[PDB]
Amino acid sequence: ICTCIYRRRVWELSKANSRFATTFYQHLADSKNDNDNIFLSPLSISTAFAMTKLGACNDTLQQLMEVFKFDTISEKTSDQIHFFFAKLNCRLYRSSKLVSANRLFGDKSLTFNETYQDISELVYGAKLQPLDFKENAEQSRAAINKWVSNKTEGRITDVIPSEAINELTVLVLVNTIYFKGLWKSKFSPENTRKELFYKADGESCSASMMYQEGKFRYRRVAEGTQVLELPFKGDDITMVLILPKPEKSLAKVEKELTPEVLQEWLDELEEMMLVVHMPRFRIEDGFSLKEQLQDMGLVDLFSPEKSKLPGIVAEGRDDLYVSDAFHKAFLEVNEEGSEAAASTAVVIAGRSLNPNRVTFKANRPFLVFIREVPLNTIIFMGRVANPCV
Amino acid sequence: PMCIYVWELSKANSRFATTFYQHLADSKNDNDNIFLSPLSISTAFAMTKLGACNDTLQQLMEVFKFDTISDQIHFFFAKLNCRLYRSKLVSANRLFGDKSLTFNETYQDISELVYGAKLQPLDFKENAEQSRAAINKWVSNKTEGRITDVIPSEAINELTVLVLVNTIYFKGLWKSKFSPENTRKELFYKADGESCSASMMYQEGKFRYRRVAEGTQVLELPFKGDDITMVLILPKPLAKVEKELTPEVLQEWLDELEEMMLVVHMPRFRIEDGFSLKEQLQDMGLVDLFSPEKSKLPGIVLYVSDAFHKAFLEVNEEGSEAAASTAVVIAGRSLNNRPFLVFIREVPLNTIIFMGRVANPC
């Protein structure tokens, strides 16, 4: 945009968004078997719900502000949050594509308040779309899924699974962020070799390991955890990997992740000339945020008995509540970046490199982050626990 | 003339190129970068050839591989040169002989018509040093200021008869220029246990590539006229390809190149190298010409005493400039992970004109 209440601005909100991001990851991770891959965008989640908060009141509002940690932005009122999001968004959605598919669908004569409509449209770029859930749920589901697959250029198709929508749904929320980007320092396909990945428990399996030597921001911190930042073409988006000393389990790294120690690691990285080895991997993960969030304190927005949602009116039957909330994420990373494999081979001539150069061999499970650096905003988060094919 | 005893010529020449390289390579150490122009050396000696005779003429015909294609060779070399000097590829040839000696007419007439070589009088007999200093000055002008010292110091003395000189100079712009904005400095740790600073260039584009046998990468960067080209040979992360380099090999590699897209990283550097042609040439077979009691050289007014060579190359963002001379001195006292191969070839006539080894680019 660039030009009911509870209680630079971009730096404050990025911090809030990061604390939620860590906590939601730690919970989601806690819920899972270690050999499972995780990948999700906290920013679409915090953004989708900050857009939804626009219509809530009384206690619903009060806890949205609290679950997503926006209440950490001291001396600010809930309305102020949407200005901060307006700023953050302007900047974010200016060889790095960031496409945000985000929407609130609903209809059984659900009329959104004029201003809800307008601020969602202005600050979040969302449309609050009337969809006939009542008479034709299957076409409604199909329609939603088609809208997302259009926004995400064909990747992320089955957002809304099947049964989750039917002639009883009121409002459903769907969000994702799509990123397509090329590596700053591409790997050459001629040095992609099958090697052994050593799983969280036990199994050795074959991943296609990529290799390159280059200058990257790296540091080896406490308990031998190596942090490494690889960048995309155009130095504002980077991928940060975290690989623990093989004695220490990643699981433990997850458990001790404060956003504060995450930052502390970033400040300890320096440009350094090293040898990189990391698998090519595809991670796709999608889910209903609803149970996860409920368990974290977001109860009232989903309860027909408790949802204070002034923003939306229905003729007579006012017990409007968020029936479901879905989120999917897809990452396919290879030698070129997060985009189409083209056979760009690489020839480096005239480089004699020091022995006793540090090696980075992510051949055992590691965390992944996709960080927007100027804004310091975590766009994606994950754990490549098994890239075997 | 006395004692006779195009692609064909290009082939002959190339066979000498590689064979000269290996003899020069094994006298050097792999830490050394080494640069020369085969074409210059074969030009200057195919010019000295018009004065030789009996066994010397034969030995010259046999190590500069003209034997593979006597008098007609010089017709062919001017034809070759006619198809070759016309974006800056230029040559110059010149004889500097003693002011008092009366040089043979017909010798001088073949030299000018066939090679563009004029006889210029100098006083070797009495004012030797100003004469060698004069020759070096001609070379500088004809190589735009790059080959400056060719003739050493103590080579020309009171008894020097003729100094035959050749010059080639090239300057060309890249078909795809490397942009300077993203040229990166970085430490090159040379095997002499030290870190010297290098400056690498980066670009991405379609280039004729092929990773041939044993994983050796071969890359051909074209210059603007698409006729002169730079070929790089990089080993799979050494001396090996040098010891296996024939004109055959080079052809086969260049034959299986594919137009593919790559990211190229190559250092911005300048390399200069100079050396006496003497021993290598002799034990390649050319013994008689340097050896006083055997050198059958009638046609000129006589033994060759020592030949000297020097060359220059500089690769940069916009293109590269290279230069070389061979100076054959007739009766003057004789004296004197890292590396990749570089070839600057003219494709239509397969003329290797410059050839080298780049090691240190600091």
Residue entry with tokens 């052809």: B251
Q: Side-chain half-sphere of A173: how many Cα atoms within 13 Å?
A: 20
Q: Which residue in the block uniquely carries the two structure tokens 């290098």?
A: B198
Q: Which of A388, A366, A379, A307 shows the shortest CA–CA distance to A106?
A: A307
Among A342, A344, A352, the residue with its CB nearest the CB of B190 is A352
B residues 264-303 closer than 8 Å to A (CB):
264-267, 269
Q: DSSP state, A53?
A: H
Q: Pairing mode, if any, of strands A366-372 and A377-384?
A: antiparallel
Judge: B266–A349 Cβ closer than 8 Å, yes or no. yes
Q: Kind and range of the H or E element at B19?
A: helix B7-25
Give yes or no for A350 touching B (CB within 8 A). Answer: yes
Nearest to A47 by CA among A94, A113, A104, A110: A104
Cβ atoms of A105 and A191 within 8 Å: the answer is no
Provide, as residue numbers in chain A, all residues whose Cβ is less than 8 Å from the Cβ of B201: none
Q: How far apart are CA B199 and CA A47, in angstroms?
A: 45
CA distances from A158 to A139, A332, B198 (A): 14, 17, 52
Quote the number of domains for chain B.
2
Distance CA A379, CA A47 (A): 11
What CATH number did the domain enclosing A304 receive?
3.30.497.10
Exposed / middle / buried, residue B18 (Cβ in 10 Å: 0-12, 13-18, 19+): buried
Long-range CB contacts (within 8 A, 24+) of A89-93: A89/A1, A89/A47, A89/A123, A89/A124, A89/A125, A90/A1, A90/A2, A91/A10, A91/A374, A91/A375, A92/A372, A92/A375, A92/A377, A93/A125
Q: Chain B within 8 Å of A341 (Cβ-Cβ)?
A: no
Residues A265 and A139 in one domain: no
Are B210 and B336 in a shared domain? Answer: yes
Query: Cβ(A303)–Cβ(A60) under 8 Å?
Result: no
Residue B37 and residue B151 in one domain? yes
Assign residue A75 a region (left: φ > 0; alpha: ψ between -120 and 50; beta: otherwise): left
Let me know whether B279 and B311 are in one domain.
yes
Say which residue the tokens 């004699």 belong to.
Answer: A352
Query: Chain A contact for B238, CB < 8 A?
Result: no
Cα–Cα distance measured from residue B313 to residue B310, given in angstroms and rounded to the nearest whole number: 11
What 3-state DSSP class applies to A157? coil
Q: Does B200 touch chain A (CB under 8 A)?
A: yes
d(CA B35, CA A23): 63
Residues B164 and B62 in one domain: yes
**Token output for A386:** 């098994």
DSSP E strand stretches across B127-225: 162-173, 184-190, 194-212, 216-222
The amino acid present at A35, given as its one-letter code, is N
Say yes or no for a CB contact (<8 Å) between A190 and B211: yes
Instruction: State whether B233 and B304 are in the same domain.
Output: no
Same domain, A199 and A312: no
Q: Do B261 and A352 touch (CB under 8 A)?
A: no
Residue A381 lies in domain = 183-278+341-388
Amino acid at A368: V
Q: Is the dihedral of CA B345, B351, B353, B354 positive or negative?
A: positive
Residue ranges of A for the binding site for heparin? 11, 91, 103
Residue of A nearest to B187 (CA): A353
Looking up residue A377, the CATH number of its domain turns out to be 2.30.39.10
A352/B211 CB distance under 8 A: no
Q: In terms of CA atoms, which chain B residue is nearest residue A186? A: B263
Question: Cα angle at A183 between A180 and A189, to 5 degrees?
Answer: 110
Q: Which of A343, A348, A351 sits opposite B260 (nearest CB)?
A: A343
Indicate if A34 and A118 belong to the same structural domain.
Answer: yes
How far apart CA A156 and CA A150 sit, in angstroms, is 9
Q: Answer with the one of A316, A335, A354 that is the final residue of a domain.
A: A335
Quote the tokens at residue A123.
């600050």
Query: Exposed, middle or buried, B330 (CB in 10 Å: 0-12/13-18/19+)?
Result: buried
Residue B337 is encoded by which pair of tokens?
A: 């992970």
Residue of chain A whose Cα is closest to the Cα of B267: A350
**How many contacts, defined by CB atoms under 8 Å, are there between A and B?**
70
What residues of B are in contact with residue A190 (Cβ under 8 Å)? 211, 215
First-to-last alpha carbon distance for chain A, in angstroms, is 44
DSSP-assigned letter for residue A316: S
Residues of B in contact with A343 (CB under 8 A): 260-261
Give yes or no for B189 touching A (CB within 8 A): yes
Q: How many Cβ atoms are within 10 Å of A122's Cβ, its own excluded?
A: 12
Q: Looking at residue A110, what DSSP letter applies?
A: -
Distance CA B85, CA A267 (A): 59
Whether B191 and A352 lie within 8 Å, measured CB to CB: yes
The answer to whether the CB of B33 falls within 8 A of the CB of B269 is no
> B213: which 2 tokens?
């046998």
Same domain membership, residue A158 and residue A115: yes
Q: Which residues pair with A198 in a beta bridge?
A: A204
SS3 A318: coil
DSSP SS3 for B169: strand
Q: Is the dihedral of CA A304, A310, A314, A315 positive or negative?
A: positive
Report yes or no: A84 and A12 within 8 Å, Cβ to Cβ: yes
Asked if A136 reaches chain B (Cβ–Cβ under 8 Å), the answer is no
The angle subtended at Cα B306 by Cα B304 and Cα B307, nearest 5°, is: 100
Contact call for B358 and A350, based on CB within 8 A: yes
A186 and B CB contact within 8 Å: yes
Among the candidates A295, A318, A335, a domain finishes at A335
Same domain, B75 and B156: yes
Instruction: Give the whole-angstrom CA distance, residue B286 versus residue B56.
Output: 8
Please state, as a whole number, how many other Cβ atoms lie within 10 Å of the Cβ of residue A227: 21
Q: What is the 3-state secondary structure (H, E, C) of A183-228?
A: ECCCCCHHHEEEEEEECCCCCEEEEEEEEEEEEEEEEEECCCEEEE
Q: Is A190 on the interface with B (CB under 8 A)?
A: yes
Residue B120 contacts residue B95 (beta carbons within 8 Å): yes
**Could you tell me the two tokens for B334?**
């004789």
Cα(A253)–Cα(A240) distance, integer angstroms: 14
Residues A160 and A20 reside in one and the same domain? yes
A325 in the same domain as A383: no
Q: And the tokens for A43?
A: 């920013």
